[PDB]
Amino acid sequence: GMNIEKTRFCINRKIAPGLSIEAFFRLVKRLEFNKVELRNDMPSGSVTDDLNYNQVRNLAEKYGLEIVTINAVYPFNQLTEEVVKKTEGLLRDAQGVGARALVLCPLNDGTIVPPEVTVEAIKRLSDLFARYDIQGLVEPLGFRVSSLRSAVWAQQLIREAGSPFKVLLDTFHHHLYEEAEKEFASRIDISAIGLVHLSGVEDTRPTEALADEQRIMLSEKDVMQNYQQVQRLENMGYRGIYAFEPFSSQLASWSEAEIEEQINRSVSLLLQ
């Protein structure tokens, strides 16, 4: 059916909360992928756990992996001087491990952030990121309490900011933005989508009520239409990276074998 080069798949570290960085990298190489994402919200609380930057670089190189992003700055949108320090720390982390991009997430507490303020934040962060030679990925969050839910509108703000940043399209967040399908096909710029985050939800609770805890991997029981969201991207010309990003606490109970199975099962579902 769909011909997606295996090379284009990326494994986000959220899938493996119980694995050290070397165990995680070794698994991804065993599965013959060459892309990962690291994160500052693992149990360790550190992008590199207790390792230094050099150790992490050597590991990535030992297992032939590109670290594609770090997740994530929050809230990029409410750029106080604490948030700037928190971002500078993450920019060092990205530069040090050899990460290409750092992910930016909008305020998500039910409070309005005006588009003028978001644009100003993108401008300031674009200048700051350039200083570390890191790419920025703006990820809209679909929650009703999110200050920035539309990928289309996010792309517009980036243009107004004159920024090289791109949008991170997350299929869960698209699914929760329930006004999303109206504009999408006509208004989205595929070339300005820098990464895609995939995960499935089988949970049949109302879409309004869905949270990250329901986000598992891709099955036939998936409620969010990932196959169709991916098929559309392919048809509209997307040649970028698909990264698997589950969040559920069910993940912690998975062995290294079970993790390998779910990544294989998810990939196979897309190529069927």
Tell me which residues touch Zn ion (CB under 5 A): 123, 127, 170, 197, 245
Min separation Cβ 72 and Zn ion, Å: 8
Min separation Cβ 150 and Cl ion, Å: 22
The interface with Cl ion within residues 87-126 (CB under 5 A) comprises 123-124
Quick one: 123 or 159, whose CB is closer to Zn ion? 123
Binder of residue 29, out of Zn ion, Cl ion, none (CB less than 5 to 8 A by kind) = none
Min separation Cβ 161 and Cl ion, Å: 6
Using Cβ positions, the residue closest to Cl ion within the complex turns out to be 123
Length of the chain (residues):
272
DSSP tally for the chain: helices H, then strands E: 9, 8
Which residues sit in the known binding site? 139, 170, 197, 245
Pairing type for strands 35-39 and 193-198 reads unpaired
Quick one: 56 or 103, whose CB is closer to Zn ion? 103
Min separation Cβ 233 and Zn ion, Å: 15
- The 10 Å Cβ neighbour count of residue 130 is 13
Which regions of the chain does DSSP assign to beta strands (E)?
9-12, 35-39, 66-73, 101-104, 135-138, 166-170, 193-198, 242-244
Structure tokens that stand for 190 in this block? 């595929």
Binder of residue 170, out of Cl ion, Zn ion, none (CB less than 5 to 8 A by kind) = Zn ion
**Could you give the CA distance from residue 34 to residue 93 in angstroms, rounded to a whole number?**
20
Chain residues binding Cl ion by CB under 5 A are 123-124
